[PDB]
Design a protein around this ligand. Structure first.
Ligand SMILES: [Ca+2]
Ligand SMILES: [Ca+2]
Ligand SMILES: [Ca+2]
Ligand SMILES: [Ca+2]
Ligand SMILES: [Zn+2]
Length: 316
């Protein structure tokens, strides 16, 4: 809508207070005009019809329990936009400042979040397995990254290309978490997963096997479930990414870590310049090596580390 840009205040899912960019026109709407063509957050009102209604508030204060998921979806979409713009010089997910839209309160007791090809959608969780999904910055960044992948490499969501698609979302979801410096870690979804259990997460990049996911190509899932195991086999790539950044010895292979910033530069270049819709793990290795070569030179430590990491997880 057309209005006056202003700033409101509210509390997120985890009870933290934060300022959010809103727009005033009779009501105060969750519409941020400071980023690209805007960030819009909608209320799905427990229904499955999308996008729902643009979030309207009477006083620009968002401290109601019902407001929490909206506050975080709106705020974290902004942080993710900032990350891509400031670190990778990318304007929104399409590179041309496309408006970012999110709907919260999707369905009832919905334990999922997703990108539907046009916008982000967040369930409220059942209160046992998950609390409102937008409360996790790595979750929000994971979803917006699916949009970035769709507009660039276009990795098909099946088998190995799908696992790469998933890993890319976990990798950048984690890098955004570090960017925001919000209790950063290499775990996925820890802030909104199982509120009754502390110390766990949905997936782990540092040790995928902790939750039963493969950490070596020899342990890859070859079944048909989960579109060929896209959320399972992503562990192989997530582990490789973790090793490239942090280093370590895995299955007898030692990797010298090169840091998170370089990891991000290497994978962003691979994603936007070399990967294609049908790329498999072997091609991802080639793309990553080429990207590191472009940026640091063929005889650099960076290239060596990328090769070592993929060797460690059995990807040739
Ligand atoms: Ca209010
Ligand atoms: Ca964290
Ligand atoms: Ca995390
Ligand atoms: Ca938990
Ligand atoms: Zn995903």
């Amino acid at each position: 809508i057309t209005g006056t840009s202003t700033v409101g205040v509210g509390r997120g899912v985890l009870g933290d207070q934060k300022n959010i960019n809103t727009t005033y026109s009779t009501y105060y709407y969750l519409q941020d005009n400071t980023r690209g063509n805007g960030i819009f957050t909608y209320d799905a009102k427990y229904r499955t019809t999308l996008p729902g209604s643009l979030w309207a508030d009477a006083d620009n204060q968002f401290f109601a329990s019902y407001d929490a998921p909206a506050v975080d979806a709106h705020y974290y979409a902004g942080v993710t936009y900032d990350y891509y713009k400031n670190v990778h010089n990318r304007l929104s997910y399409d590179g041309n400042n496309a408006a970012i839209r999110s709907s919260v309160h999707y369905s009832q007791g919905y334990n999922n979040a997703f990108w539907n090809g046009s916008q982000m959608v967040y369930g409220d969780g059942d209160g046992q397995t998950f609390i409102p999904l937008s409360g996790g910055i790595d979750v929000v960044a994971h979803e917006l990254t699916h949009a970035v992948t769709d507009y660039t490499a276009g990795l098909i969501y099946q088998n190995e290309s799908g696992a790469i698609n998933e890993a890319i979302s976990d990798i950048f979801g984690t890098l955004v978490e570090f960017y925001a410096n919000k209790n950063p870690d290499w775990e996925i979804g820890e802030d909104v997963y199982t509120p009754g259990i502390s110390g766990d997460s949905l997936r782990s990049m540092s040790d995928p096997a902790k939750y039963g996911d493969p950490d070596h190509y020899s342990k890859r899932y070859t079944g048909t479930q989960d579109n060929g195991g896209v959320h399972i086999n992503s562990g192989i790539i997530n582990k490789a990414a973790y090793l490239i950044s942090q280093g370590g010895t895995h299955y007898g292979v030692s990797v010298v870590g090169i840091g998170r910033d370089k990891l991000g530069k290497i994978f962003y270049r691979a994603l936007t310049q070399y990967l294609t819709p049908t790329s498999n793990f072997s091609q991802l290795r080639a793309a990553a090596v080429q990207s590191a070569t472009d940026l640091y030179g063929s005889t650099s430590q960076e290239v060596a580390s990328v090769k070592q990491a993929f060797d460690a997880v059995g990807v040739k």
